[PDB]
């Protein structure tokens, strides 16, 4: 207990972190020698697979100084910028050292550029205190952030006074929000004349070789990170020259560190082909068909939201959800507990076959829960909240919305 | 023109970044094949030297999968936390992705833990807007920060109402502030009952295996970064468990990324022994003896502040400053222009012998500046302001302090 932070990671029954010695492709080794198949994948930042051979060679080389120096510019800086710009659009691009740092810099630049105070937010934007919850729903926090919890009725209300709004900033979820959700969000922002920031730290580059919301939102500013460097310490922002002009005041010491630029340039190259995204979709979709039949044949009341790119178990009770991850653990399948499961491209037939096999065995372990009452909406809203930090799309009136927020906050 | 940021880096006479294609030890090669001896060394974060073989090999093995996974905890997390704790003291340790992020998190944690609004600051703390200047000297900015510019007179004033003060946060400079200055700062903060945060992002682990101000300040909370990983993207905060409890709320996606953890463990192993810091001190002091002698023999009105660990040229005039770096640029000595020079442990006998010959050539180019009026205090103040973003220690009354602030802000 030297560690001052509480990092999100695999934890065991005593909530102590699982210690992993090694990993390659889709497989992990733990400290007891027990081997796992990884559906966490550093929260979906491992798009390609652990230890990816070709990224590894580019990073190993950069470490020797052969591609440049942390002292200053290298043409790999130009290549990473150029790639991102091609993939995501906009006029300008900036690089940062986490998703957190990127989203904060982007929204503060917009606030400065527009001269307006309030940020209207849905979703998680990172650990920084600027995003901490207000004393009550719909009121601005200490840093001028109002959370609207992906409720478009609440957003529409807020946008009836757009003079005070620097930007709307949204973290997509494609498991729990439909395409028409996003189009309504875009229509409302455009009618109000308000800047739209897509926080694609998680979803950017994974659904497509580009922004998952490039056409759905056509955002004024974007942020990506998890998809861009197979796990390495980099994020990016882009959009219009005028709104990001304040980013000119950003500099940081490690900006030119070559191994990160190596990893980003290698990983982005594949990202740009479409293939790893196809492979993950196709692979996790295979695994999903299989998992859904196994839960069904087993009479287990667990729905699965989403798709091969990201999916989430939605069990009918919290008891069952815990048992589920209990059994998965017992079988060497590493899920990100309660959150979204994101396979990597290292999910070939061998892995899929074993994972399917290990999932059947999870269903076997779970047979005491066979025939429980099927999934209701309270479970769906609970489980979606854990992944999105706000409300899944479903029909509701204002009273229902208010009740949900009271319950879940 | 894709980059939205304006990174600090070596820039040519047209203000364009120099392009470096490779580096090894003390030496850089640029896009034209010109070879440079590096005194900038990623703003001092390259303590060991470019492409340090042991670190590079730690990084290579970690990029394979064989030395931990981004998905979660590893034995190298413990080794890093343990090492920092041993070198720097305190009860807990936290890891971050840049000095900016680390100092922001540290100070916000102290603000939350004490419950008091104001941060009293000297020095540079990172690019974040929380540090932007106030409307007037001695007024807090919009984020509750009041800059005292290293003037203990001004600090005493601000310490007259300490109930409102969460911390004093200071970035040391050992070229322009004496040991007695630190002791008095220490005294002051203790009498006022205020928390002292030493921002050792630059100086930590470089003057000694641990904190430069360990004895002088005995700070409540410390921050280090540039010393810990031979340029790789990590920083650390440590100190009181109580004061850093708010850091429990920190998590980021790349926390377990293995190449950075390996680089840090390998670098900190070397740092703990005291050897690289001794090598740097001795190598730099040797260069300084030669440089001071060459300047004097040439009748050039340029002093040198500092020592082998970090030194700064202090030219009598801005014209002569620009001529100095122009001449150094022509001879392939890469100085961090106007700022501090920080050699690495790869500065061996052969590097020093060539740097001496190059600096002799520099002084020959500056012949036309021979015999100019000797350095005055206005020059010393302007030059020191560039490295510390505040006032070098020297006798002043308040009016003169005020006067300097008006001049240099
Ligand atoms: C849209 C978005 N914007 C910025 C960030 C910050 O990026 P970074 O971690 O690099 O600083 C993330 C980081 N994502 C990590 C996790 O964040 C969320 O998890 C939060 C979680 O939802 C929240 O309730 C809890 N307080 C902490 C936890 N880290 C998501 N539910 C999860 O799918 C994600 O994997 C993000 O998803
Ligand atoms: C004490 C301290 N705390 C946090 C940080 C931020 O760390 P990071 O860059 O990793 O985010 C630094 C970063 N240091 C980089 C430079 O910062 C200052 O340079 C500033 C410079 O003084 C300032 O005027 C300018 N606007 C930006 C410039 N980077 C120092 N003069 C220099 O010696 C340094 O090498 C630091 O020195
Ligand atoms: Cl003083």
From Swiss-Prot, chains A, B:
Its EC number is 2.6.1.93, 2.6.1.95. Its cofactor is pyridoxal 5'-phosphate. GO terms for molecular function: pyridoxal phosphate binding; transaminase activity. InterPro entries: Aminotrans_3, PyrdxlP-dep_Trfase, PyrdxlP-dep_Trfase_major, PyrdxlP-dep_Trfase_small. It catalyses: neomycin C + 2-oxoglutarate = 6'''-deamino-6'''-oxoneomycin C + L-glutamate; neamine + 2-oxoglutarate = 6'-oxoparomamine + L-glutamate. The modification N6-(pyridoxal phosphate)lysine is found at residue 226. Gene3D superfamilies: Aspartate Aminotransferase, domain 1, Type I PLP-dependent aspartate aminotransferase-like (Major domain). Keywords: Aminotransferase, Antibiotic biosynthesis, Pyridoxal phosphate, Transferase. Pathway: Antibiotic biosynthesis; neomycin biosynthesis. Pfam families: Aminotran_3. GO terms for biological process: neomycin biosynthetic process. The keyword Cell wall biogenesis/degradation does not apply. 6'-oxoglucosaminyl:L-glutamate aminotransferase that catalyzes pyridoxal-5'-phosphate-mediated transamination for the conversion of paromamine to neamine in the biosynthetic pathway of neomycin. Also able to catalyze deamination at C-6''' of neomycin. Belongs to the class-III pyridoxal-phosphate-dependent aminotransferase family. This is Neamine transaminase NeoN. It comes from Streptomyces fradiae (Streptomyces roseoflavus). The lineage of its organism: Bacteria, Bacillati, Actinomycetota, Actinomycetes, Kitasatosporales. The gene is neoN.
């Amino acid at each position: 207990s030297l560690l001052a932070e509480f990092p999100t990671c695999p934890r065991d029954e005593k909530d102590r972190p699982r210690v992993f010695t090694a990993a390659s492709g889709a497989w992990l080794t733990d400290e007891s020698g027990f081997r796992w198949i990884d559906f966490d994948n550093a929260r979906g930042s491992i798009l390609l697979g652990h230890g990816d051979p070709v990224v590894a060679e580019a990073v190993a080389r950069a470490a020797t100084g052969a591609d440049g120096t942390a002292t200053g510019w290298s043409r790999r800086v130009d290549a990473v910028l150029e790639r991102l710009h091609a993939l995501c659009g906009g006029e300008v691009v900036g690089l940062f050292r986490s998703g957190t740092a990127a989203v904060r810099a982007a929204v503060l630049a917009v606030r400065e550029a527009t001269g307006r105070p309030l940020l209207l937010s849905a979703g998680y934007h990172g650990y920084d205190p600027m995003w901490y919850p207000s004393e009550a729903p719909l009121e601005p926090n200490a840093d001028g952030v109002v959370d609207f919890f992906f409720d478009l009725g609440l957003l529409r209300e807020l946008l009836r006074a757009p003079e005070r709004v620097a930007a709307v900033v949204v973290s997509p979820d494609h498991m729990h929000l439909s395409p028409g959700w996003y189009r309504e969000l875009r229509r409302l922002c455009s009618a109000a004349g308000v800047v739209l920031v897509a926080d694609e730290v998680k979803v950017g580059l994974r659904y497509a070789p580009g922004l998952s919301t490039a056409e759905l939102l056509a955002p004024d500013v974007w942020v990506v990170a998890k998809g861009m460097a197979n796990g390495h310490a980099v994020s990016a922002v882009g959009g219009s020259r005028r709104l990001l002009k304040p980013l000119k005041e950003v500099s940081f010491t490690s900006f030119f560190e070559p191994t990160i630029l190596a990893a980003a340039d290698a990983a982005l190259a594949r990202v740009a082909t479409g293939e790893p995204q196809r492979a993950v979709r196709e692979a996790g979709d295979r695994f999903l068909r299989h998992a859904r039949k196994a839960l069904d044949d087993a009479s287990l009341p667990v729905e699965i939201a989403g798709d091969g790119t990201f999916f989430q178990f939605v069990p009918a009770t919290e008891e069952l959800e815990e048992a589920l991850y209990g059994a998965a653990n017992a079988e060497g399948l590493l899920f990100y507990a309660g959150d979204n499961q994101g396979v990597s491209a290292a999910f070939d037939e061998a892995v899929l076959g074993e994972a399917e096999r290990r999932f059947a065995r999870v269903c076997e372990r779970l047979a005491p829960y066979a025939g429980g009452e099927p999934v209701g909406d309270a479970a769906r809203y609970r489980v979606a909240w854990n992944v999105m930090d706000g409300l899944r799309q479903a029909p509701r009136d204002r009273e229902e919305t208010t009740g949900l927020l009271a319950r879940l906050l």
